[PDB]
Design an enzyme around this catalytic site. Sequence first.
Site, PDB file in Angstrom:
ATOM      1  N   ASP A  97      32.649  39.836  -6.135  1.00  0.00           N
ATOM      2  CA  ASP A  97      33.526  40.431  -5.068  1.00  0.00           C
ATOM      3  C   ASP A  97      32.418  41.230  -4.615  1.00  0.00           C
ATOM      4  O   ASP A  97      32.948  41.210  -2.849  1.00  0.00           O
ATOM      5  CB  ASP A  97      34.669  41.507  -5.900  1.00  0.00           C
ATOM      6  CG  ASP A  97      35.497  42.260  -4.823  1.00  0.00           C
ATOM      7  OD1 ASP A  97      36.293  40.650  -4.691  1.00  0.00           O
ATOM      8  OD2 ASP A  97      35.408  42.923  -4.628  1.00  0.00           O
ATOM      9  N   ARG A 111      29.102  50.985  -3.447  1.00  0.00           N
ATOM     10  CA  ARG A 111      29.547  50.510  -4.528  1.00  0.00           C
ATOM     11  C   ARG A 111      29.138  51.662  -5.117  1.00  0.00           C
ATOM     12  O   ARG A 111      28.476  52.070  -4.821  1.00  0.00           O
ATOM     13  CB  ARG A 111      29.916  48.942  -4.957  1.00  0.00           C
ATOM     14  CG  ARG A 111      30.277  49.026  -6.524  1.00  0.00           C
ATOM     15  CD  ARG A 111      31.300  48.823  -6.251  1.00  0.00           C
ATOM     16  NE  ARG A 111      32.530  47.956  -6.096  1.00  0.00           N
ATOM     17  CZ  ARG A 111      33.157  47.499  -5.297  1.00  0.00           C
ATOM     18  NH1 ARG A 111      34.271  48.201  -6.135  1.00  0.00           N
ATOM     19  NH2 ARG A 111      33.764  46.346  -5.786  1.00  0.00           N
ATOM     20  N   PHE A 121      48.162  50.321  -9.008  1.00  0.00           N
ATOM     21  CA  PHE A 121      46.494  50.434  -8.732  1.00  0.00           C
ATOM     22  C   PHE A 121      45.919  49.561  -7.834  1.00  0.00           C
ATOM     23  O   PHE A 121      44.687  50.261  -6.796  1.00  0.00           O
ATOM     24  CB  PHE A 121      46.037  50.811  -9.799  1.00  0.00           C
ATOM     25  CG  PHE A 121      44.487  51.024 -10.101  1.00  0.00           C
ATOM     26  CD1 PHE A 121      44.192  52.286 -10.260  1.00  0.00           C
ATOM     27  CD2 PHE A 121      43.188  50.082 -10.107  1.00  0.00           C
ATOM     28  CE1 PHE A 121      42.848  51.825 -10.138  1.00  0.00           C
ATOM     29  CE2 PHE A 121      41.903  49.567  -9.684  1.00  0.00           C
ATOM     30  CZ  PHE A 121      42.393  51.366 -10.172  1.00  0.00           C
ATOM     31  N   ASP A 147      43.923  49.346  -2.051  1.00  0.00           N
ATOM     32  CA  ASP A 147      44.363  48.848  -0.744  1.00  0.00           C
ATOM     33  C   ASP A 147      44.365  49.944   0.134  1.00  0.00           C
ATOM     34  O   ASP A 147      44.057  49.511   1.356  1.00  0.00           O
ATOM     35  CB  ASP A 147      45.886  48.061  -0.274  1.00  0.00           C
ATOM     36  CG  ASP A 147      45.286  46.900  -0.965  1.00  0.00           C
ATOM     37  OD1 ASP A 147      44.039  46.208  -1.761  1.00  0.00           O
ATOM     38  OD2 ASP A 147      46.541  45.872  -1.116  1.00  0.00           O
TER      39      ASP A 147
END
Lengths: 336, 336
Positions: free
Chosen positions: A89, A98, A225, A230
Amino acid sequence: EKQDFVQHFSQIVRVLTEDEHPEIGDAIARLKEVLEYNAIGGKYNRGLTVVVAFRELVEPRKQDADSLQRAWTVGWCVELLQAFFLVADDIMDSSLTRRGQICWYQKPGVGLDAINDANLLEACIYRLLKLYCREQPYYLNLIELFLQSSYQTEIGQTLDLLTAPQGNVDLVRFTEKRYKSIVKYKTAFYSFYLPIAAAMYMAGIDGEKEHANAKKILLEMGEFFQIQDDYLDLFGDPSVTGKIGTDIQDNKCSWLVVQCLQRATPEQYQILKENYGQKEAEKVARVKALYEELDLPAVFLQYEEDSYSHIMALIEQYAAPLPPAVFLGLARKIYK
Amino acid sequence: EKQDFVQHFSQIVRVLTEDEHPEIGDAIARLKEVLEYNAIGGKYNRGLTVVVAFRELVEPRKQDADSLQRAWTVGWCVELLQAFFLVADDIMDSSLTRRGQICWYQKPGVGLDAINDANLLEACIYRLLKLYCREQPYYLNLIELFLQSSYQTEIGQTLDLLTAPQGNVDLVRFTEKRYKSIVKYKTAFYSFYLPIAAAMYMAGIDGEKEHANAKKILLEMGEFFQIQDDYLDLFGDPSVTGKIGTDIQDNKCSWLVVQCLQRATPEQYQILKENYGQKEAEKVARVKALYEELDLPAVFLQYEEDSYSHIMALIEQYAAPLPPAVFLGLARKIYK
Ligand SMILES: O=P(O)(O)C(O)(Cc1cccnc1)P(=O)(O)O
Ligand SMILES: O=P(O)(O)C(O)(Cc1cccnc1)P(=O)(O)O
Ligand SMILES: [Mg+2]
Ligand SMILES: [Mg+2]
Ligand SMILES: [Mg+2]
Ligand SMILES: [Mg+2]
Ligand SMILES: [Mg+2]
Ligand SMILES: [Mg+2]
């Protein structure tokens, strides 16, 4: 509990790396690196959910040292699955960071080799299940659960990506119906259903109707979640979230843009049309300013409250005969 | 036989696409596209090997319509696995064409989304095994075989890529020992052992020693097949191979460069050092000309003969109690 879970990782890395067959040496080494960089640094909620639920569903007289080890390992399997998906992803979403460090594929000397590295993380799931759960009654149920949850997550990712074509105005595509399908498949199955269902199978709760009932609650929690994910992509504190947001410049069907499209005036629709889906900081800022002008933070906060009440109503309807505490501890953790 | 095998693909695509749950529609559609573009256009040798071996190992009175269907489907599973690996391998090797058309990830509108598309092809394997083999005695043996062969192929790919760092002179790394480890893991398990072993499990040949004996032959055949793949990367006819060669510019540990390093004079070593591993056509041509100057085509041809004799000697040693014809039909096909 999170310190105990993280301590078991040394052991996992040790059994995954014991095949060193000197020949495969240098790839085992690389596999250690991929595991150290990529499954560590999160909150570990999905993996801990397996362990917490295991302790709540299994009779304590059946919770010996080795069955507890199997629970810790299956929880790490759920974390390896998330690590597989995130790696890939981050490539496909062109993400920068990340968990407070650069995405693995931006690491100099990795790049698109990260693709193999992610496949190996997936592979480790099944090696661990074989090393630990092979002679258990629930072995095949777990393999099948992990495979199915992968399939379902990849279907979701497929929809995510088809609804978000690069360089192409996709606003007509961005609807509530579509959004709900995306998040059901891409996030809800593996983040919530998967770990609870895994603990259920380990505890000998195999019934179709009990799994369906648990799924009714858990897929709605997963929907929330992802909505929260978002919201925080743009409005979250990146020293907390550990990641830079790319949804606007990636042209994503975010809850935010869906909610914006249903409130925007025809003038505001054109602002979004002219600025959504593009790499330019100034364009991304116009969209954020439209969200803020539409009081979308206020809308998210109200949705969070309404969603909580809805999930608690479903726990009342569907938790039995499982302990509500299983679902309530999860709710506490995600509406925190 | 190859026309019958290819005809069964319509049915496979049909069952993989029957979940159309209207919501997941547009990703099922995309999944069709990925299957149509990516598992069709090869020679189908690996998938046919499952079917051919099944017919030779199973008593004909046990070869009813449905057990034959399961054999065709497992052979397509082996082809889906190869399709998974190739898609991802074409991204990581920066390849241009595959099977006479542009690599899927070069298709406009695909790009790095191909990463998801490949994961979905892997996922389809397990969906097909569940749809078709779930109630068979060998179900778990097949799932485990496919997972293990994936792991082993990803370990191989890891070594392939670590031995071939971009922009970095890697000649000291390029040895026979290393080459043999690479190809064992990246190619030999899934291309040869996997399909024969799958047919063996379907036929109820589960013994450890029979699988070991079959593996002794099949891993050596796979070694040859990858050596041949390396030779043809540079010296093959691209209207036959269907793919452009990238090993030199990708800095690969090819059989060719290994063989070149053991014959090159110190002047020739420097030619290789200055020209291997770089994108410039003129540099790639200097390397090819050094290979040709070293009579490497002549060396490959002699190796092909010696390898054939060696494999036939191992069939004599290790085929029993399996029909030698299983191994001999395979040999015919790869030394063709
Ligand atoms: O961590 P991310 O990138 O915010 C995300 O949640 C990651 C993710 C990966 C795979 C499936 N579901 C969510 P996304 O959907 O990309 O917004
Ligand atoms: O088809 P290719 O790219 O020539 C190859 O055989 C493809 C391949 C992919 C995965 C595992 N083994 C071989 P390679 O190793 O890349 O030379
Ligand atoms: Mg993302
Ligand atoms: Mg994403
Ligand atoms: Mg996000
Ligand atoms: Mg390649
Ligand atoms: Mg390759
Ligand atoms: Mg090749």
